[model samples]
Target: SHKVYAHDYQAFWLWSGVNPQPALQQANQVYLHQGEVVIRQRAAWFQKMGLPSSRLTLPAMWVTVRITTLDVPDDILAILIDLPRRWAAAGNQVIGLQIDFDAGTYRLDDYAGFLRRVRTKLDPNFALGVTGLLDIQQLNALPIDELVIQTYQGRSTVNQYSRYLPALLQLRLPFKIGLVQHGEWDPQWEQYLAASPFYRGEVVFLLNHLRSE
Candidate 1:
C-alpha cells in the first residue's frame, strides 16, 4: 500500500517531455535527460532532447546523456564532456554528467572502460555518475562519483526488487536507489538502505500523465 512521492526526495530523473517545474521545485539535484547518443549505420550522433537549458531552475543539475553504444566518436564524446559547463553557464548549478546506459551484467567491464575514458576527458571540478543495473556488483571499482541502481521496469517496480538488496549493500561506492513515480515501495527498505554507509538517497523517475483522449 505504500507509494513513492517525487517531492520526498532531493534528487530526480527528469526525462524529456515531463514537466520540470514540479520536480524543480523540490529537487536539490536533478538528472535531466538532455539527449541520447544514438548509433546508426556504424556511426553515432547526439540527438538533443528535453527542455532547453533556459527553462531549468534548480540548486544542482546533472545533464544526463543516454548512450546506446560505448564506441562513441570524438565529436559525441566532446559534446558529452562539455554538457555540464554548457548547463552551468546557463545559470543552473551543474553538478556533472550522468550517463544512462543499461549495460548487461557481463558487459560491466567494457562499460567501466568507457567510463574511465570519459572520466579522463571530463572536467575535474565536475563529477561523474552512472545508472546501474541491480545485478551489477562490480561498480565499486568503476571511476564514478555515484551509482543509481534502478528498481523499476516499464514504469513499475520490478517484482521482488528487494532480493537484490543484499548485493547492493555490499557496494562500497556512494549509491542511490532509483524508484518510479507512483510505483510500489516499502519504507522498510529505506531503513535498510539508510543503514548502509554508502547509501546516498533515492532518485525518483518522474512519469508523465497518460493522454486521456
Candidate 2:
C-alpha cells in the first residue's frame, strides 16, 4: 500500500461499536453507463456502528473510487479529473492513480491516445500509473510513469516479468516507472538489482485486485 494518503481515522468510532476492528465494508459495485466501467465503494459501516461520515476511510487504503477506474470515452476524461477532486475535497492528497487495462486491444494508436489524454489531464504534480500486462512494446511505451506487470492469475501466456531485467531493459523506453509484483514472483525477475541504475527507481507496489473477480 502507498503511504497513508488519507488520515481521517477515528479510533473510537472504528473500535468502539463494531463486530471487528477497523470495520469498514465494501458498499457497491455499480456498472457505468451501458457497462463501460464498473465502480465499487468501500466505507466503514456508518449507520451500523454510528461512525462519523468523515471518519470511515482507512488511512492506508485508497477507496475504489479514489483509485484508477476504466476510462472508456474520450470525454469520460471528466471522471478522470474528478477522482482526485473528491479526495482533495475530503482533505486527502491523492498520492497516485493506478489503472488496469485488460490487454492490448493493442492499438499503438489507442494506447497512445489514452495516454495522451490522461497525461494532458493528469495533474503534473501527482502520480499517474498504468499497468502494462506482457508486451515488450507496451511496456516500452511512454504513456504513464509507473508500470505494474501482473503475474499471478492472468489466465493467459502474458510474459509476466519472468524475463531477465537485462533483457527487459533492452527495449529501453524513455520513461521507466516502478514495477509491482502483482501476483506470483518470477524467479527470473530477481536477476535485476532492485532500483538499480539500469532500472529507473522501480518501486515495488503490492496490490489486491480481487474486486475484478
Candidate 3:
C-alpha cells in the first residue's frame, strides 16, 4: 500500500471541525463544507457548519453542501444558490458549488434530474461539482462540471477501493480522486489516473489533525 501526503496535493476538502490553515498553505483549490440540508417532517432546512466566509483566503473555493434528502424545497434551494455569491462577496475566489449527496446506485436517474434542476437555477458564473460514490456509473452524462470520487470513509480509505478504479476509466468528464488525509493510497493507481485525459488532480479530504497513514 502507498500513502498520500497532504503537501503532495494542491486541492483539499475542508470540512468543519478541521483546521484549514495547514491545507491553505499549499492548496490552490479547496472544497469547503458549508452545511448540510436535512428533511424533517417533510420540511427541509440547512444546518450551517464550517468556517465563516470571512475567514477564508484561498485562490479557488467551492462550497460543498451535504444533503440528507433530495426533496429540496424552494427556500432550501434559494439558500443553496445564494451561498456562493455570499462567499464571493466576502472576498473569496468562489469557483462554484459541489453537492455532497449519497445517491444510491439504483436511483441515479432521480439524482440526475435533481442536479439538472439545481443547475438550471444556479448562476452561470459558478461551476457545478459533485461528490460521487465508488459504484456510480455513466457519470459523463450527469449535469456537472466536475466529479470527486470519494475513496475514503471516516478516517481511513475504503476497503479495496482499487477494485472500483477500473470502472472510472469510462468517465469522460474531468474527475478527481478524493483521498482522505493520511489515508492509504497507491502511487501506481495515481499513475493510471494521471495518464487519463479526464483526470484533473487529487483533492485531499482534510482531517482535524495529522495522524498515521
Candidate 4:
C-alpha cells in the first residue's frame, strides 16, 4: 500500500506572460522574477496581460533574478542586494532571495564563484536559494541554502522522481520540487512522495488560468 502525504506548496511566476490571481498568491513562498537588466517585470508585458500594477499585491515576495553565465553577478550585486530592501521598505516581508540561471555543465565553477560574491554581500539571515540543474551532482559543490529541482519545462511535465529519487534522497541539504501549476498529479508520484522521508514541498508555475486539459 502506498501512503499519501499532504504537500505544502510554494509559487513562482517566473515567466513573461499570464497574470497571477490572489488564490495563487496564497503560497508558502512567492518567487517573482524581477527582470534581468531591469528590476521587476516590464510594464508593457503586464499591460498586455490585463494586469495593472494595482493587481500585483504580493506581500513580502521573494524575487528571482535570471542571469546568464556570461554576465558577472558582481556587476549588479548592489542592485540585486538593495532590491530586496526596497521591497521591505514598502511594508512587505521579503522572505527569500534566489538567483535563476541554467549554467552549462562546464561553467558551474564560474557560476559558483559568482554566487559566492553575492552570498558574502547578502545579509546572512536572508535565505539564499537557487533553481539548480536536473543533475543535482553538478551543483553538489556549490554553496546554496536551498535547491529547487525543476521537473517541468515550458508547460510540459517530466517524471523525474523515479529516475533521480535515489540519488536525490542521498542529499542532505534542503530542496523543493518545481511542478506545472495546471499540470497533472499522477498517483504513482503521489505514492512516491508519501514514502519519501526528506521530501520538501513543491512550487507550481501558473502559465495560464486554471482549467481542465
Candidate 5:
C-alpha cells in the first residue's frame, strides 16, 4: 500500500529510544507527543538512535495528544485549546496537531465539547483532528479538519467497521482509515473501499516493532 503521509508516521510513547533509519528521510512528517501538548526534550538515548536531539529539528510533523478520558470539566478546555497554539510556537514546526481518544457512546458529548473548544481556540493555518470511535453516533457535534477511524484494536480488528459505515459515510468532511502493518487486514475492507470514496487515504501504522519502541 502507498504511504499517504509519505513517512513511517512514527508515534512514540516516550521521548526517545525510537530508531531513525534512512526510510525516515522520505517521511514528510513524524508524530510527537507526551500525551499532552508541550514537547519535552528528548533523552540522550534518542540521539544515540540517530534521531534528532529534539522535535524542533524534525521536519514537518504532528504532535499527537492521546486523551484517555474526557470525564473532567472545562479547565480541560484551557489545556486542549492551548495545545495546538503552544505547539506552533514551540519551534518544532508542525503541519498539524491530533487528538487521539476513544470516547465511548456515553462520553461522545463531552468529547464533542472538548473538540469544539479546541477548534475555537485553534488557528486555521494548522489543522486539528481526532481519532474516531465508530460507535460514537454523533460525529457532527465535534468540529475537526479530519477524522481517522482506527479499525485495529490491540491484536485484532474490530467488527464495527461496516456497522458504523452508514453513519461515517454521512460525514461531509475528509476522513482517513487507520490500518496496521503487522496485524490482519480484513479481506472485506477492499470491497468496502471499492464502493466508497469518502476516505482521503490510509494511515498504516506499523505495529509490534514500532509500538514498543
Candidate 6:
C-alpha cells in the first residue's frame, strides 16, 4: 500500500479531457475550486465514484463573499449557500465551508461587519471557516468560527509569531489556530511557538495542501 497523492493530478486530468478515476480512487476529498465552469459531468462522475452528493463541496474556500469585491457580504452569502444547499438537496450531510483569504488587513469595523453579515445566513451549526495568515491585527478582532491562520503556521519566523503571541494572550479571545506546515513552515519554528504559552491556536492541516506536484 502507498500514501496516494491524487488530489491535484486527478484534477489536472479532469480539466484536460481525460478520465482521472484511476488516480482519484483513493482521494478522500474531491475539490473543484473557484470558476467551476465544467461541473455537471464532473458531478455525475463523482456520483459514479461513490462520492456522496454531500461531500462534493466548493470554494466558499476564500473570504465567503470577497467582502471587498462586492462591498457587501450579502451577495457573497447567497453564492456560498448554493454549495451546501445543493449538497443537502442531493441527500448528503454538507461537510464544511472553508474560506481562504488573509483577512488581517481589514480593521475591526470591516472585519466584524463582514462576519456579522455572514453569520446572519448560516445555520447555527454551519462550520464557517477561514485560514490564518501572517497577520497580527485581525487575529485580535474577529471571532472566527474556525479561526485558521496557516499555510505557513509551523514555519513562520519565530520572531514574527512571537511578537503576535502577546496580543493573542491579552485579547484572551477563544478560537483554535490551525497549523499548515508546508513549504516554508518547517517543524523547528513550530516547536518554538508550541513551547511558549501565549499562543492559543491549534495545529492541523485541513485542506488544499499547496504544492506544484
Give a tens-digit lDDT track for model 6, residues 1-213.
112233322121121122234434543332222322112432211112213235433322221221222143354466664655555565544444544454335555766665666557766555665444646454455645555444344333233444444344343333434442222233344444555454443433323423664
Task: Indicate the worst ten consecutive residues by lDDT in candidate 4.
Answer: 43-52
Can you give the TM-score per candidate against the true fold?
A: 0.92, 0.51, 0.92, 0.73, 0.64, 0.49
Candidate 6's C-alpha runs over 4 A off are 1-70, 91-96, 102-105, 136-141, 151-182, 189-213
The candidate, 2 or 6, that scores higher on lDDT is 6
| Residue 205 C-alpha lDDT in model 6 | 34
Across 34-148, the per-residue lDDT of candidate 3 in tens digits comes to 8898876877778889887684567689999987788777777888989998898898888999999863444777788888988887899999999955663555789999999
Q: Which residue pairs in model 3 clash with each other?
A: none
CA shift of 145, model 2, Å: 1.7
- Using TM-score as the measure, name the better of candidate 5 and candidate 6: 5
What TM-score does candidate 1 reach?
0.92
Which number leads on lDDT?
A: 3
Off by over 4 Å in 2: 1-71, 136-141, 154-161, 164-166, 171-183, 186-188, 191-195, 198-213
Q: What's the ranking of the predictions by TM-score, best on top?
A: 3, 1, 4, 5, 2, 6
Winner on lDDT between 4 and 5 is 4
lDDT of 5 by residue, 1-213 (tens): 232232433432222334444434554555554343221342111111122324445656665666645544455545555555566666667667678774445556677787776666666677887774555345654677777777667545565555665555566666766654444455455456545565665555533354567
Give the C-alpha lDDT of model 6: 0.40
lDDT of 4 by residue, 44-133 (tens): 111111222232467556667665443554546766776666666666677767877654554667878878888888877677878744
Q: What CA root-mean-square deviation does each model show from the true structure?
A: 1.9, 11.1, 2.3, 6.0, 7.3, 9.9
Q: How well is each residue in 1-213 modelled by candidate 2, as lDDT tens digits? A: 222111221111112122222212321111010111333352211111122223234442221111223334545555555554555566654444444455434566666676777668866765665544444666466576555443323322234345434455554532233333232343334335343444433222323335577
Give the alpha-carbon lDDT of every model.
0.82, 0.38, 0.84, 0.60, 0.54, 0.40
Report the number of backbone clashes for model 6.
12
Model 3 is weakest, by summed lDDT over 10 consecutive residues, at: 132-141
Cα error, residue 57 of model 6, in Å, equals 11
